[PDB]
Paper text:
Phosphotriesterase-like Lactonases (PLLs) are appealing candidates, being natural lactonases endowed with promiscuous phosphotriesterase activity. PTEs and PLLs belong to the amidohydrolase superfamily, and share the same (β/α)8 barrel topology. SsoPox is a very appealing candidate for the bioremediation of phosphotriesters because of its unique thermal stability, and its ability to resist aging, solvent and protease treatments.
Of them, the most active variants, αsA1 (C258L-I261F-W263A), αsA6 (F46L-C258A-W263M-I280T), αsB5 (V27A-I76T-Y97W-Y99F-L130P-L226V), αsC6 (L72I-Y99F-I122L-L228M-F229S-W263L), and αsD6 (V27A-Y97W-L228M-W263M) were subject to kinetic and structural characterization. Overall, all variant exhibits improved catalytic efficiencies against all tested substrates, with the exception of αsA1 with malathion (~2-fold decrease).
Residue numbers in the entry:
A (entry chain A): 1 to 261, 271 to 314
B (entry chain D): 1 to 314
The structure:
Amino acid sequence: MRIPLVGKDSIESKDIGFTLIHEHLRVFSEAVRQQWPHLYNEDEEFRNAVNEVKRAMQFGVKTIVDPTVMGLGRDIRFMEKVVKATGINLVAGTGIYIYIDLPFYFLNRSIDEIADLFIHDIKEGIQGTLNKAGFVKIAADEPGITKDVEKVIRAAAIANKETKVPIITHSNAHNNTGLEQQRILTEEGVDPGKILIGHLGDTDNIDYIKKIADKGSFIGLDRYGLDLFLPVDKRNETTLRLIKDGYSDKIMISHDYLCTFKPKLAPRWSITLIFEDTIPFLKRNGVNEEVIATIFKENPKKFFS
Amino acid sequence: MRIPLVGKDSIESKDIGFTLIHEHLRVFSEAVRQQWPHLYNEDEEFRNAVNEVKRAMQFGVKTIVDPTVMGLGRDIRFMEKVVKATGINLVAGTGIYIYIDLPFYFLNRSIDEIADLFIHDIKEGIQGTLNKAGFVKIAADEPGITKDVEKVIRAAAIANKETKVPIITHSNAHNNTGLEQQRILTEEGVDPGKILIGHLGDTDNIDYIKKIADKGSFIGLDRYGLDLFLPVDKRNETTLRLIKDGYSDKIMISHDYLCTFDAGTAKPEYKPKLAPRWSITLIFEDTIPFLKRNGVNEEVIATIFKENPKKFFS
Ligand SMILES: [Co+2]
Ligand SMILES: [Co+2]
Ligand SMILES: [Fe+2]
Ligand SMILES: [Fe+2]
């Protein structure tokens, strides 16, 4: 009745339950895979995604939000297959993931034309299916807010205003891209509480994280396990600090795990690391179950309502 | 047998006949087309491509070389359908068309791993078929020779050295990228005669063009009809001058026609001020008649359109 799900009837936000807000079943570069299909093994990809998702569900995860969009190899049919094999609630999105320029398709195309693509996926369905997009994903990274990155951001704001679906972002935690995304969306009329600024858990700069939260958006502590960006124990210290300072109303936690899509870079990276390490860490440091529920149930409910 | 053809037995290069060295049956952004198929009408693309190819064949064209590769929507199965509807000799390629950065697949991958993809397409076949690639296509434009652009350039060198297929380039005629491409490839051991430096017809700077040709490479006068890069009359004037100064044996001419393109610019849609007479047969309607009435004999026309493509693929 409000949040579309891959391969199922849409649900009211009250039924989302325990959510992993940012996880990927599979990512790839569309052009590479179309051109050199011998590099990929779909059977293996499917088997690893299904296993990872089953494991999450054994810890009580009900819904996964998967922000694989254009540029990351969104495949709605693969997603459907995983949903049939697992029973997971899966929220698919629309959007564009670029760091510099858009594909040449977009040359002399307006922001509204871009937004029309997102709205098509939200109102009509994704890739020829009746599976509808539940959110818009956008990105910026080390190159910053380029001209084309900015067009995409503005297009996301149009789609949100027209359809009410929330916006998930990718940012670089160390160069202000997050704060800029929030600002441009917000200036374009997006409710700050319909934005999740992503990858803030990549830094232990608490003042920058709070800045974005205090402007009204969710803060993505969303790469647990990617030690190369920030080690688990430092993420844990940051999370705990934010909870202790009263920020659990804006915290969202996830792994950004690539289910099929490393001893030094990400030794215990998986879709269940927060059950194995983070949540027990927090509980040992005095965080109650009510806070856990706020982060993994209440916050996603608010984001999608 | 020595040039692979899509949907046909390979041909000796001496049999290639009258050739258009750089034309596209269809181009698109793979990511866009994968994510928003509602934007594209395959029927219309197929009908347009077939119509263009048949009209080129009526003018005597035997062979078309199509440098649509990764980044431009190469689709060997579409190409097969076009061959089967027309009987054209079609040469498909491999390569990577980027202006700035490689797709994220290539993060922390070596130049060799890039080359192996090219070698795969040339020795094994394209996209799971046995249609083999006959050349490598690479690109550089306004952003210049970026690090990833250079990785692709060096990958093409390795592929040529291993398989012997020639290299076609896309360049920006106004920023030296063509000469940079030639430089880096010749440094890596590629024979200059196996390189076509593209889009040099986009300038009337005759001295730049000549510099590349004197270094031993073919020069692509290859966007006839794309008036936004350079109008037909200035292209014709440049082409003629090069032929008079003795450069016939290095000149290749084409239209770079996109029988179907997905960009919004779209150089011919309510916007045919950018490319009014642009089609795959414009050289038969304008350029060849112009050369012929300005002292260029049938021999020189045969050199450009038959002999040079034959050498390039030998
Ligand atoms: Co991200
Ligand atoms: Co080109
Ligand atoms: Fe992600
Ligand atoms: Fe081209």
